[PDB]
Amino acid sequence: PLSLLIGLRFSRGRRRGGMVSLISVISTIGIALGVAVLIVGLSAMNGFERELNNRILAVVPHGEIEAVDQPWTNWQEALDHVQKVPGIAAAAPYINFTGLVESGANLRAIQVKGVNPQQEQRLSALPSFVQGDAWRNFKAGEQQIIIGKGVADALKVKQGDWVSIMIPNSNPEHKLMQPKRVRLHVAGILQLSGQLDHSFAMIPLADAQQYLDMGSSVSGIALKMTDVFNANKLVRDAGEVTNSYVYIKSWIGTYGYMYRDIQMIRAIMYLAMVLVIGVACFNIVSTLVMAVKDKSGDIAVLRTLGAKDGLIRAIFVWYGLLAGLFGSLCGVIIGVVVSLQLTPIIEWIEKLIGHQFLSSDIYFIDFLPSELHWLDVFYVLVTALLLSLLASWYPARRASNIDPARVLS
Amino acid sequence: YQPVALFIGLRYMRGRAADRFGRFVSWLSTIGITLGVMALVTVLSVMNGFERELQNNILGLMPQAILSSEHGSLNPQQLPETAVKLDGVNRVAPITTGDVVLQSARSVAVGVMLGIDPAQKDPLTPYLVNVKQTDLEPGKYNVILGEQLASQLGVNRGDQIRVMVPSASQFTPMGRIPSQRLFNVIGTFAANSEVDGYEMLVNIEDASRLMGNITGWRLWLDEPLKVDSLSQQKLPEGSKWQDWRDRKGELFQAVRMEKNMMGLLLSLIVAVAAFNIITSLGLMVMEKQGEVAILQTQGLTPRQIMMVFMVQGASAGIIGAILGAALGALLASQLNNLMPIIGVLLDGAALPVAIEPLQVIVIALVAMAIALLSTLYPSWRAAATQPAEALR
């Protein structure tokens, strides 16, 4: 069901000349160089957002309600008020301990916290990233400790080794008497994405009360919320039921800057590829104006046969789209074989240069993911065709004003 | 009329069409290189402004390189300040380093010892919040803690802490005991950076480490972007070069890897524009095949007729790189000067810019190189062909 505006101009592109066979090769390569890299460019941006909800957002609590330098003697009634908040899923207490480890003539910054091992699987995905066989051995009364992956590289210890950490004394008077060192044995290590490997440790809540020589008193209250895009309003109203004012915080001020840097690339890479396809559509203009002056005899034939102005103008519109559609669809075939198989590609370059990039020290992760979305394929297809239609519209207006009586008809 | 026989037959091949649209088609190769340079120098200018402000708050507040000995400490009487005349050094000051650990009545912390001389000028002196530099007296053991360091430790002014050195420990035959003394605090300074959480100002004369001497000398550099380039120069004997790459060797190295990825993605604009020269000159030879055989009959060697089409592919690269660098430097300097023209960003951090004059010259020579190597193949097809066997 071919229409009249497109016509039968598929056979017009099968021209024969000199070096014109090489011009058609570069015209579909340079216009696909900005399309095939934009599909794999936005694939890694979706992979960074997918790994954030499983390795970053699922391992830290959202809302943190601490105490302003005071031991909470009535923290049992505060857990019932935060649980009935319309928008808070669960709640669990935690005690912050600012201690270090001194084993093997080294110095590492570790942040150990006291969480209940029976209630840690209801607010965060913390024990789902342990390299050990199980984690149910975290009972009360045997001095357990579990460290990260970035601590064992400096201490050179494995599962079953006794280590000595620095535990501060909770003296009521401001004085120093002696440092406290308690021998603890590790029962396996855990791995995380790229940040909380050398500064993460956990102790049970029943084993943390004997270090402060207290009874039943915690310091902070952790929680988990359903919606994560609004983490500033759910923390303010949840702290107005315990006392007058406490120190409130969230994951926006310490981990929420990654969403600003991910969305900034989408506002830059998509803006940069406008100028890439914009200078790639100049190849269509250089082959459309060149296709007018040599084939100007066939334009004067159709004017003598009784063609209107809209018919002789729409010929070169669909003629310039044939060189663009073959190059735009050539980037979709490359865009699905590189994005779906990116993990054998990035690892292949790192083992031939000598040094690998994207280290797991201050970055997000160590590997490079790619989550191909079919909605972004339709967005890049219409964007490459909208610039090709704007580039072929202006030579189509020039070809509609050719005098048929000037050329020898 | 020109005295050069090669540039005379090309001044009329760019403006042969006196039309409103026919002149814009032949000048399409100029806009492709102009828009490719101004989208490269302007974007890399705000990336250099991020690296400029990162060194003024981290590397501008810590010692970059220390000239320490390989046998432990360094005697100041053997290596004075007159025999340390190296390249890039403008000021030599005595300093000591070392991994230390805090010990307070509430919690412990991490940090490195930074012993300075109070009789010399220090850049941390405007950042001292009501703390005089003359209070750091030898024998008093006064420690000036940081803003973020004392905030999480709970140590206010007029308190007493304990500093232990696990690295420089006395190897006693009976066991392993670290050296530690009693230390009192005098104040808290703030600088609005990240180095305040692990750096304190103590006296230079201390007995917590080994041996009264120092460990090394603090040296300042004019450009700290090339520490690895001057790491293979002539050093005096009995010394070891220790730079900031042992601790901060992955932070400032991470910024240089991001410039090789953004700068290579923006280099695809001139790569496709270099492919436009092959198509603009590849179709120009086949529509002007009769003009090639005329010059061969009037007398012209095929070596010189290859250079004729080389000027058409190099005229867009010369004037495209100068105009692209002029508009690229004007957009970066006048970005947030008069009015925001790129959009109201929700940051509010007063985004700066840094235009390096050496970076403009190396970028413009790249666009004049890939535009010249892509011209050799359309220029060779117009000379290797036969003048009379082609069409006439």
Partner: peptide, 10 residues
């Protein structure tokens, strides 16, 4: 990335 500020809110 490389654009960090480390600003907290009490």
């Amino acid at each position: 990335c490389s654009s960090n500020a480390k600003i907290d809110q009490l």
